[PDB]
Design a binder for this molecule. Sequence first.
Ligand SMILES: CNC(=O)c1cn(C)c2ccccc12
Ligand SMILES: CNC(=O)c1cn(C)c2ccccc12
Ligand SMILES: CNC(=O)c1cn(C)c2ccccc12
Ligand SMILES: CNC(=O)c1cn(C)c2ccccc12
Lengths: 245, 179
Amino acid sequence: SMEMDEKDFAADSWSLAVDSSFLQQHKKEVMKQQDVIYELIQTELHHVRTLKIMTRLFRTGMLEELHLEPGVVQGLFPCVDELSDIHTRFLSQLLERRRQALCPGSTRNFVIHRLGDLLISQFSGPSAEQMCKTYSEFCSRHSKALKLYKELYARDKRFQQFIRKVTRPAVLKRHGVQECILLVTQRITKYPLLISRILQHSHGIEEERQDLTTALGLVKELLSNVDEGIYQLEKGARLQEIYNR
Amino acid sequence: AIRKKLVIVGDGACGKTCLLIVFSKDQFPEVYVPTVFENYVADIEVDGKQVELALWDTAGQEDYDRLRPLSYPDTDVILMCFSIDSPDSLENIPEKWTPEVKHFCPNVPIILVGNKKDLRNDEHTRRELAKMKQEPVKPEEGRDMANRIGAFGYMECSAKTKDGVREVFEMATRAALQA
Ligand SMILES: CNC(=O)c1cn(C)c2ccccc12
Ligand SMILES: CNC(=O)c1cn(C)c2ccccc12
Ligand SMILES: CNC(=O)c1cn(C)c2ccccc12
Ligand SMILES: CNC(=O)c1cn(C)c2ccccc12
């Protein structure tokens, strides 16, 4: 992540990110809603950072330093460029909504009142179709990526040394290859929990309550479609094993 | 420091997310309790052995039967949670969660954990449950369920007061280290 966004989301909550004199101006219900919206954006920033570790540190590092057989790097990191484009675009929209909401003279005091419309846009139309297509492909290739990683780590000296080198820094403690893959697979199922809690504190404006109710329904339809479109791929599985599913 | 993986399972109301949050911060959040848990790698020393224990939550995956099992590969220990204020969460352990964990995590130790033990003697909880002809889970009901499902052991904790939380994760680490 870039320093400006890391500092804007360094605090454990929106109530600790804004100036205390600005916090004092809002009612408790507004503070509760803003704290959950801040968690959705903060966790989206971290999810985009996970995808940048996968594309820049791991994938690009393996292409530039190791002599792997063709198709091996794509097998370890399926769909990572498409996932990076989807979420960097979504994060850009969330951060622009926050930036427009800033008070003049401040880089930290804001209230986002209209998130629902942004979530409906993300989770409908062509962007929802692309999220469904990409996650159905990624999640169906998840077992295969983990197995290929385990094989290379145990049999290839140079691969093991590369992984130990780039994952040595303390800032990579939670972000080994297999950990990144599961953080990405689990991201999509965090959205309903976050949206439902924002909705619980968004009754003050009826149009906002209706828009977040619509967004929650669209996210659950996307998740149901991805879940029904998954079938784990296995290297070396024969056609007979497949058509006898 | 050897690396081990822990996964927590249980119904949406079992308190699994709060349990991981409180353990990972050694604190019940004073200002904001997070809605979700990403992951964490805890440095734990148990009985003289140093382990890096990776922690994962299954919250949000309960309705998605093809996404949920992607959390299980290479798990070394399972915490299977229920809430003591919810006999309904305990009823879903033996024939829903247990056969799933035994299928995807064969031979992995399961610790059955009764969460929210601070509510066993809470007047409001006892009043609400009595309307559905129910009462908080008794410790013998928890132990008998753990015995029935082939659990490695039975433990209780309260994420609210932190009591029992450290003990659950130190025991999970010991279970993960066993042959
Ligand atoms: C055309 N094929 C598709 O899969 C989808 C199209 N829309 C709009 C979706 C929304 C949620 C989930 C899937 C789709
Ligand atoms: C009044 N407080 C609440 O409603 C919540 C508190 N946490 C941590 C939640 C997580 C998911 C959904 C709702 C909540
Ligand atoms: C989500 N659960 C599955 O996909 C399962 C597939 N088999 C064969 C099972 C056996 C016992 C328990 C669960 C499963
Ligand atoms: C249903 N199958 C069983 O084996 C058990 C049932 N109850 C109540 C038990 C208590 C302790 C140990 C085993 C069981």
